[PDB]
Paper text:
LpxA and LpxD are functionally and structurally similar, sharing a homotrimer architecture and conserved active site features, especially in the acyl-chain binding pockets that reside in the dimer interface of the β-helix trimer core. Herein we report the discovery of several small molecules that bind to both P. aeruginosa LpxA and LpxD with μM affinity, identified using a targeted structure-based methodology that utilizes molecular docking, surface plasmon resonance (SPR) bioanalysis, and high-resolution X-ray crystallography.
The complex structure of LpxA with compound 2 was solved at 2.00 Å. Corresponding ligand electron density is seen at all 6 active sites within the asymmetric unit. Similar to 1, two binding modes were observed for compound 2, with differences mainly in the conformation of the flexible side chain bearing the carboxyl group. Five out of the six copies of compound 2 adopt a binding conformation represented by pose 1, with the carboxyl group placed near His156. In the other binding mode (pose 2), the carboxyl group is pushed away from His156 due to a new conformation of this residue. Many of the interactions formed by compound 1 with LpxA are also seen with compound 2, especially for pose 1, including the hydrogen bonds between the carboxyl group and Gln157, and between the carbonyl group and Gly151. Meanwhile, the benzoxazine ring forms non-polar contacts with Ala136 and Val132, and the hydrocarbon ruler Met169. Whereas both the ring structures of compounds 1 and 2 are buried in the acyl chain pocket, the benzoxazine ring of compound 2 is pulled slightly outward, likely due to the hydrogen bonding interactions between the substituted amide group and residues His121 and Asp70 that have been proposed to be directly involved in catalysis. The docking result predicted that compound 2 would be buried deeper in the acyl chain pocket, similar to 1. This is likely due to the protein template used in the rigid docking procedure, which failed to account for the HB interactions with His121, Asp70 and Gln157.
Author numbering:
A (entry chain B), C (entry chain A): 2 to 258
B (entry chain C): 3 to 258
Amino acid sequence: SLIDPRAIIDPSARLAADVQVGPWSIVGAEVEIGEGTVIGPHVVLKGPTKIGKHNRIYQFSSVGEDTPDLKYKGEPTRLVIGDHNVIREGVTIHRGTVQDRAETTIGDHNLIMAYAHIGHDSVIGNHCILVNNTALAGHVHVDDWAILSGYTLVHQYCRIGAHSFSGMGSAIGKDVPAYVTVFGNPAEARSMNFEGMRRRGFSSEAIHALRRAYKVVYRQGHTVEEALAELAESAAQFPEVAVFRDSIQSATRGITR
Amino acid sequence: LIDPRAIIDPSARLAADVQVGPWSIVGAEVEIGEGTVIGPHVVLKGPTKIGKHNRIYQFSSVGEDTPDLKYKGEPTRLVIGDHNVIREGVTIHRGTVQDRAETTIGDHNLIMAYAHIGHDSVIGNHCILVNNTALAGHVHVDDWAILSGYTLVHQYCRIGAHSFSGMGSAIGKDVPAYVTVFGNPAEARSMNFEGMRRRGFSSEAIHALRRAYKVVYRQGHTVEEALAELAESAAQFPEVAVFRDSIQSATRGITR
Amino acid sequence: SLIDPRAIIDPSARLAADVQVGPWSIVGAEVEIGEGTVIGPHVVLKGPTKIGKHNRIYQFSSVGEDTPDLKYKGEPTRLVIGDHNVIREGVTIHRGTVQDRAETTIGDHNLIMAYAHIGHDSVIGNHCILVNNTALAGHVHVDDWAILSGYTLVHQYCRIGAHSFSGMGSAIGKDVPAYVTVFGNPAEARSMNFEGMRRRGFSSEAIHALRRAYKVVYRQGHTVEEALAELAESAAQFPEVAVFRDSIQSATRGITR
Ligand SMILES: NC(=O)[C@H]1CN(C(=O)CSCCC(=O)O)c2ccccc2O1
Ligand SMILES: NC(=O)[C@H]1CN(C(=O)CSCCC(=O)O)c2ccccc2O1
Ligand SMILES: NC(=O)[C@H]1CN(C(=O)CSCCC(=O)O)c2ccccc2O1
Ligand SMILES: [Ca+2]
């Protein structure tokens, strides 16, 4: 059928009628798979885990394993994956811990390339790209349209802002505000992702307002609280600047400079 | 020879000699040449041609579509030559129509565990890609180059013949032939004198290349002035011609 | 003791009581597996290799392969793994070479996370943590209670001292003394793993003697020789300082500064 007979499907697994599963893949207990999803060959799915519609998961991926994190001690934690995601070769995704929200969450239209790691309790939004070997250490929040280039390392609890960009081999120990571009080990704030803003149809007015907001946070010698007070006027006028100001206000590990 | 637990597509073409391990998939339009050993748990996808006396290790994906968004299903190709070793979990992607629609690997290359050969990359002969080396795409690696563990190469970069990268090198610009580079970002340190000894280079050639490095890196010349100074040495020693041509064809700039 | 019939067990392999082997795993010739070891699915074991008791080995791991450069050709060479080790998704562990130890050795209670690499002739002690994609290039010694954060790179012949710590994406080219914390590419010494000493129940006076032993080596412009002769007395008092002194005395290839 669409389920390869060489696949192991746990009787407790729930598959929508058109789900494809390849040879030598394991669909574990308490795994749910939504309509149109294709599971390649040599995939291990472990639950409790929910996968949505029209997803593609590639060979040698381990989706829904326990974190090796020594704070995890066997409790019933979840992984939720949305719709229209692509999960490439050798990707590892772990379920959450009771210490946080007992859930790891991915939304829709994400591209997660080969040997990427999505650590316990991470939250990925929609339309994100994680290039080869991007490692999210745990409790990492990645907001919509962020792009992490190959071998980007993200420390535990870091927030990656909407429409942000990391250069290849970036080592992120602090939060990346929305729209900010970071490079290097350790990661350094260069500019804003003006290329991504134009690709996603931002107004000229919003881009100019974001250009000015960067300057207020990074280039006028303000403390963060001083910069947040200076951003208030622009943030009230433009939602993009409010997105920026909020990423800064909610950046619990401080911002990448 | 072909394990009964392997899946061979009807449209694949295997030379008589070829071994395929259990639980390996040999997909549509994959050709595998005589003496080649496909390990267990290998995924091959085409259109792909693999030459003679290759060895591909468990959990490799060789000939997959690039996930690069600019790829759209075109029947792009991967060509691998002879006598290559492809170790555990290596990813090799076919080309894109935007470039020349082909990822190309030559002969006698060693590609160690979890290395990545991005779409449209061109590898020559006798190269070593150490563990987790990543060719981002459209990367040209000339003969005898050695990239140490976790070397990242930016799209379109050229790695010169007998060049060498230290472990964790991040290469954003062309590496000239023989040049040894280290760090993130990568910087030129010296020449691969050991690679030269390994090839039985004459003391004369080794001497002239030591001079040539100084001309380019240590004597304050622009690249133009450097090329002019190298012309006589380039004419006398083919070994220096290689160095000189690698700088000539680096329209991007050279790793400093 | 569930041996999945879909695994290939070599007639020369030896399985102790309560060994589990998941489906589509290979236990090669001259592989020995000790009591209660769990081998997951899609595992490749090559010998000659001896694995002890109550280990866990995850899917896609290659344990006991040969080093890839054909210039190390030579047999037999060995891999020894002790007890209570956890080896996660897609770990590579290579046997030794006749040109050196002829053995790769791992002790007990080690955590080796996804896609870590243990190079030929490496020696790992007890209670070590190697985080995602840590690579020991070859002939690397990791002493007890060391932690290597994700994507730590270790050069051939380097020693990682007892209770030492490396920040994520460290490139270690020189010996890391016992207790010392290192960060960056290339790796630099920042401090000592005090947080680690405390949670191992080190006496406060021992911790203070190590705070002094650090300053005596790194921050007082002493030679190595000078530094050692000054710590003779403290090293006679505190076994802990002796462990620090010994890690420096036995680094003729220089220490990470
Ligand atoms: N989608 C792709 O083509 C590539 C690009 N890439 C990147 O990190 C983006 S290229 C950035 C480096 C530059 O400036 O060339 C990448 C890096 C490492 C492995 C696979 C990859 O996939
Ligand atoms: N806990 C995990 O599973 C994480 C933590 N981590 C780190 O680099 C730091 S963990 C410091 C060692 C200690 O656990 O005490 C990490 C980084 C990059 C990828 C995966 C990772 O796995
Ligand atoms: N021959 C092998 O099997 C090794 C060598 N190697 C290298 O990066 C080259 S040696 C690093 C340089 C120095 O130790 O000083 C390496 C590095 C990281 C992972 C696996 C590796 O495989
Ligand atoms: Ca700045």
